[PDB]
Amino acid sequence: ANPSRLIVAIEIVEDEIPLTKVDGLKARIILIEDNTSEVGTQRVLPGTLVSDKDGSQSLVYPLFEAPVSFFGKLGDSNGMRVWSTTTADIEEFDEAAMAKFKTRQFRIQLIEKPESPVIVKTADQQDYLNITFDKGVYSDMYNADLYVGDVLVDSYSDDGVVSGLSPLYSPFSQFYVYHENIDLVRQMIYDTEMRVNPAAAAHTTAPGEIDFLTFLAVDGDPYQGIQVLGPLDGGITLGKDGNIYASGGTDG
C-alpha cells in the first residue's frame, strides 16, 4: 500500500559546548518516520533537545526526503550513505567547481541489506554519485550536472536503449531537497563558526560551503562551533560507513 521512505533531518540548539566553554551549537542528525505525508511537506518543528545555557529548545529541520520505488516492507532494505568532500583525502574532487559556485561537494551511495551492507552501483557502474545539494552546479571534471534532485534517480536508472539490456530502475523514485531549510541550517553554522573561529573564513568563505551532514570543514577539520551528538546521544553518524535505511513500508 505504501512505499518505504527516508527523511533526513538535523536537530540543532544554541548551547555552551566545549571548544577542544564557548557559545556555539549542539547538533544531531535524525530520521523522520513518515510515509503518509506528501513528499516535500515536512515542517521545521521543535525537537526534544533543550539547552543547558538558556533554556531554549531545539528545532528539527527536514533536509532531504527519498521515497522507495516499489510497494512493500522489503523497501525497508533500501537505504543510503552520504559524506562531504575534503582537501585532505586520497580521492580528489572538483575544487574549481566548488570555488566557482561557492558550494560543497558530497558523495552519496545507495545500499541494500542484508548487511557490511551491499552497494547498489549506478547505471554507469560507479560505486557512488558525486552531488551538490544546490542547483545550477555543472562540473567539468565529471562533465555532469551535480544537483542531487536532477541527477540521482536518473543516474541509478537505465531505460536500456543504447545499453541494450533490460530497463534498469532506481530503488529511490525521487530525491526531494529542502532548500530553504538547508540554507537556514548552513547560515546558522557559518555564523556561529565565523564568530567562534574567525580564521575558518579562509577556506569557508560562504555559508554554501558548510558541510551540514558530517560537519567537516573543507580543510578536513571539524567545525569548532559544533558539538556533534552520536548514537550515545540520540544521534546518527552519517559518512562513508554511516548507514541509513528507508522505513515504514506497508503491504496491505
Q: How far is the C-alpha of 229 from the C-alpha of 68, rounded, in Å? A: 28
Resolution (A): 18.0
How many CB atoms are closer than 10 A to CB 251? Answer: 9
Q: Show the 3-state SS of the chain.
A: CECCEEEEEEEEEEEEECCCCEEEEEEEEEECCCCCCCCCCCCCEEEEEECCCCCCEEEEEEEEEEEECCCCHHHHHEEEEEEECCCCCCCCCCHHHHHHHCCCCEEEEEEECCCCCEECCCCCCCCCEEEECCCCCEECCCCEECEHHHHHHHHCCECCCCCCCCCECCCECCCEECHHHHHHHHHHHHHHHHHHCHHHHHCCCCHHHCCCCCCECCCCCECCCEEECCHHHCCCCCCCCCCEECECCECC
Instruction: Report the C-alpha gap between 157 and 151 in whole angstroms.
Output: 10
Q: How far is CA 223 from CA 62, 102, 133, 191, 214, in A?
A: 21, 18, 20, 12, 10
Instruction: Give the type of residue at 14.
Output: E
Burial class (CB in 10 A: 0-12, 13-18, 19+), 72: middle
> What contacts 133, CB < 8 A, 6 or more positions away?
64, 103, 104, 106, 147, 148, 177, 179, 182
* Cβ-based neighbour number of residue 201 at 10 Å: 12
The label of the residue with cell 541509478 reads 156
Q: In whole angstroms, what separates CA 133 from the centre of its chain?
A: 8
Experimental method: cryo-EM
C-beta separation of 153 from 174 below 8 A: yes
Residues with Cβ < 8 Å from 248, sequence gap 6 or more? 2, 4, 5, 33, 34, 35, 76
C-beta separation of 65 from 48 below 8 A: no
